[PDB]
Amino acid sequence: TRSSRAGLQFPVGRVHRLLRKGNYAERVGAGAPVYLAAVLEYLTAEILELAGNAARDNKKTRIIPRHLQLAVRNDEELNKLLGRVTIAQGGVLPNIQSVLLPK
Amino acid sequence: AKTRSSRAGLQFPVGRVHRLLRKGNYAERVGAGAPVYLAAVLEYLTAEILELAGNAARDNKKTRIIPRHLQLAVRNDEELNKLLGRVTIAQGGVLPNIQSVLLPK
Amino acid sequence: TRKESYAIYVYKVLKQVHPDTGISSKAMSIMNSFVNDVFERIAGEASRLAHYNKRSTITSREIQTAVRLLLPGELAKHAVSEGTKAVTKYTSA
Amino acid sequence: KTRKESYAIYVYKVLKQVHPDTGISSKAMSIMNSFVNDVFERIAGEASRLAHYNKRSTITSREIQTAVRLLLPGELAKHAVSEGTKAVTKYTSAK
Amino acid sequence: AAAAAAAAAAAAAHRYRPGTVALREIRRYQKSTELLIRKLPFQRLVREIAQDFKTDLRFQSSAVMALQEASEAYLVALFEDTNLCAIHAKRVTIMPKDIQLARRIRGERA
Amino acid sequence: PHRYRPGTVALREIRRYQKSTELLIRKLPFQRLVREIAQDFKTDLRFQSSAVMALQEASEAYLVALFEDTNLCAIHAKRVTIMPKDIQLARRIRGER
Amino acid sequence: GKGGAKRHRKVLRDNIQGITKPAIRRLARRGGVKRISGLIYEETRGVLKVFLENVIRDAVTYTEHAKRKTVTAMDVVYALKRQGRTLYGFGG
Amino acid sequence: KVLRDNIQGITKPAIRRLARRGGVKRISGLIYEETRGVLKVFLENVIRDAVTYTEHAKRKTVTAMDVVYALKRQGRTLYGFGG
Amino acid sequence: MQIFVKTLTGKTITLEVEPSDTIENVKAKIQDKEGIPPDQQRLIFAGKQLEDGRTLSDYNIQKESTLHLVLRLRGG
Amino acid sequence: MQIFVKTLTGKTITLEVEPSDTIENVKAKIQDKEGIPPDQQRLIFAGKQLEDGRTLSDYNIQKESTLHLVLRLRGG
DNA sequence: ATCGATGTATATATCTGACACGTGCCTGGAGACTAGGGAGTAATCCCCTTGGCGGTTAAAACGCGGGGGACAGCGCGTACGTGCGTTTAAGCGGTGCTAGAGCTGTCTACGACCAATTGAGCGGCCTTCGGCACCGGGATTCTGATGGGCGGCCGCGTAT
DNA sequence: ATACGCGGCCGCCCATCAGAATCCCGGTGCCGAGGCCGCTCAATTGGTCGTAGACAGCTCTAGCACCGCTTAAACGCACGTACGCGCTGTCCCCCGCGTTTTAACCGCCAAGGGGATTACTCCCTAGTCTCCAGGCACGTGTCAGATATATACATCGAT
């Protein structure tokens, strides 16, 4: 049943409904609900873990907002995908500009 | 009057715009005076833009109107180019504008 | 087979306002493009709002605000006015 | 009562999959659903756009397939397709 | 023959004093994630202008919280470039214009 | 014998060139270049002559805009000639990349 | 030169005098510049004002297209979305 | 024949004229090369977006029409040639 | 030069104008006297509607002509 | 120092790596002697499957450590 | 200080090919009818936002002074624009071909529609073991008043 | 009158008993996965008619490619003046810091406005029918603007 037959972690019989109720095209291609659940799970997983790494970087048991952006902001790729989407209680990377050195 | 446009006193196509609102999937039910309202609106805008476009054409010694005439017409007015700021122009061309300081003593 | 244009609607109004004047063939095309874009941003606007509070209708007011927001002031307000008058014009008739 | 549904069940197992006895705040949880729902419209809307350009009237998987390709940069994109193509491929195998 | 030692830093350690805090506060501010601007003056600032565009206004607790977040974040970002501009100039000083260029080229500023 | 004082010619054209609409890039080389990359995804594909122009306009204007941002920053420094960094500086701030 | 039943009440929460100047510098260093001009920070609030209006402009509009007295935070989001400064964390 | 020695086609003068259009007054030697790189960046991404639809359409002769939609995607809408 | 405008009531107002003055300038003057906005004014003389962006001289309107002010005929 | 891995075969293999050096970097050197991909190899220490970009100090590795090895499944 | 040479505007008529027209046919527009569920309005309740209030308690808020960064002066260097001459290659409109776009016509796969049954999902509620940092009992080590015996007090004191 | 005795004091090493202090064994407080649960309302199951849409067919457009005379644009090459830019040096505008005064923040206690659901009917639209003229293709020519060629002045810089 959906997750089973498809073999994914995401809800295949949930995004099908919204795509038909959003009202995208006339009817809906059979391709999509299933495919559309798949990439979504894939992205879901790509962040959680780097967020995990980031929390472990500075040694923490639980991940929190601060971690998430630290993870993404540092990453080259994700960072561009969410280039201008701006973020809850996030703060920022340590950055020291060059000629502002304490010589 | 038979023609709808005329019942609302206009040049813009009442019913052609109605169908375009149904072939665009935008929603399950199409409104009745929406169509008109909308037609009429653009009508103004066109005019608004097309009113100076001509004036620009007058400006430069021509009786016709080439596209730059649309371009200058849109850039100068702040309430015109402001909206279209995300519009770039078939051979738009440029406002003569030379920055303050590189001009010579 | 049936290439559409909004050239016909521009064609009258042009003359209505500057009768000793004309359009470039590409300048008209540019205008054709412009209206449709312009038709879509609004329509798009309209649709989102309908959906937001689950509205199975684009009424005559849903468009009105939509424009109000979409447009810079001086232009927006005149257009708001033309709009109601037209409804005024059409319903009794 | 009220509804206000979210993707909380899906995000949670994913994180379990990648550090099982690792934790999360109730503030980063919404960021996550906010993030998903955001990507949802981004992809499905674009699909809608192409469908009624080159003149057809339903949205299948292929389109997403195409859509995805230009919505994202080189390296992630290929792996993403791959994953995507197989998941479904298996889905059909069963039936 | 007893010799109490100056081993502990006190207020003579940490190198000298020239440009000593300058970079210090920066770091502590970064590790933290608290609002830079107060959350009481800001609250009225909005209520007050919001009246001028409409009457009989109400506000969700968060709605402002949210604006604060937006705004703060909005400025920092601004400054962040400003800084660069500032550097470009042979300067470590954000200037009244440094602000303008930044905005002008982003495009809200003319 | 006569040669124009430096900076007397360049401005004159700026404007001449500002008034007009006509494209600055070459029809042949442009085209070849477009073909070069397109092949690199998939090889040997065709485009209507206009389709090429459609593409040609969108970028010709695009530069001229960036050069304008590059110039302000050159000015901001008390300078006179658009240097490299300014372009990059500009690129970084727009945060396109 | 009289007591004259004098009563003093002036306004410093909302109004820009009232707000705290360090509140800004607090902001300035996160960026990490070494120096703050007096002139500059005054301008900066100036712009804040410009940014702040447009949003509320829209906010107000969405509150009002629905005939609602209570302004939603979502309402702010869409506003931000329109200018391309959308906020994750909120109001899916 | 794979097209190459292309990048240069956009010779010294043409890059320069753009800049005057820009309202720059003068120009160092170095950046003729820098811009070509970007120009390329920009073309690549757009053509990348464009080509897919064309493939999507079971065709080769990629249309002007795609050039444009593809431009609308990156966020450089064009008024002039389309639909 | 002066022109005249016969308002809705039949009352005539005097405007000081040049023949190169635009219809909107005259409508702005009528707004300044009567409080009617330019967009709600139609200025009529003898079976021509005078249009925005055009001049008094575009319609050969000269000295001590009387224009007729009307509002917007609504189908009702 | 010395780092120890226990394989599925059971046979014990002894190799010497700097503690500062990252685990991923050390795996590469051990994947050139056996001719086996680091990807394929899965290692667990003290109930935790080994994590990429985790330093040996953050893993509290000790000399003569005992790490369980798991072979990998991809069906296709 | 008068002059020249260049660049730009402006004058001329004129020929041509695109913008405008008229015509005429057909698909897209208007009108007429119904049905049903979209969307308003009209009714109740209780949550949410606003307010006022005291009180510390750290921050806001100042200043003064001088250090350190900004800006004005100076001076050398050299690199780019403006122009010339030679050479190199696009652009120009012409032909000729067939490949691939566009049309066109029947089949059929796959989605929407109507039906009924059950379990995936959310809030609300509820759970115990494992880790951060404070903490508990017992043997053992270092400080304090005790105490006779060997020496020294020189100064009061009894015996002949 | 004249010389002997001593008396508690006192520095000495040398003996006794409890207090302080570290290791041997520690409990507590705070967060985050499991698990239970239960009515239920949203997906799934088993399934026909028809219509988009793929596909098989076709021809006749348009995308390439070539060829050659002309020529506008690109190159390479050489000079110098007026720009970058680093050096230098002071005066004063910020930092840092010492104290004085303001207002942020938390906690408490109030009241009703407004937001969300529910219940009902009637206004408004798509969807469906019939008929027709607006709007396009079809055809065709001119007139708005573009070029070439004569005509005088500006104007920045050299002398």
Author numbering:
A (entry chain C): 16 to 118
B (entry chain G): 14 to 118
C (entry chain H): 29 to 121
D (entry chain D): 28 to 122
E (entry chain E): 26 to 135
F (entry chain A): 38 to 134
G (entry chain F): 11 to 102
H (entry chain B): 20 to 102
Sentences from the paper on this structure:
Here, we report a structure for the yeast Chd1 protein in association with a nucleosome, bearing modifications that are found to occur within coding regions, where Chd1 is known to act. Conditions were established to favour binding of a single Chd1 to modified nucleosomes that included an asymmetric linker DNA extension of 14 bp in the presence of ADP-BeF. Three of these were combined and reclassified as six classes, one of which was selected for refinement. This resulted in the generation of a map with an average resolution of 4.5 Å (FSC 0.143). The higher resolution of the current structure shows that precisely two turns of nucleosomal DNA are unravelled. Coincident with repositioning of the chromodomains, ATPase lobe II is repositioned closer to lobe I. This results in residues including those contributing to the conserved Walker box motifs (K407 and R804, R807) being brought into an arrangement compatible with ATP catalysis. Density for ADP-BeF within the pocket formed by conserved residues from ATPase domains I and II is well defined. However, within the structure presented here residues ranging from 632 to 647 pack against the alpha 1 helix of histone H3. In contrast, on the unwrapped side of the nucleosome the H3 tail can be traced to alanine 26 indicating that on this side of the nucleosome the H3 tail is better ordered. On the unwrapped side of the nucleosome, the ubiquitin peptide is displaced across the lateral surface towards the DNA. The unwrapped DNA is oriented away from the lateral surface and this positions the DNA backbone at SHL6 in contact with the repositioned ubiquitin.
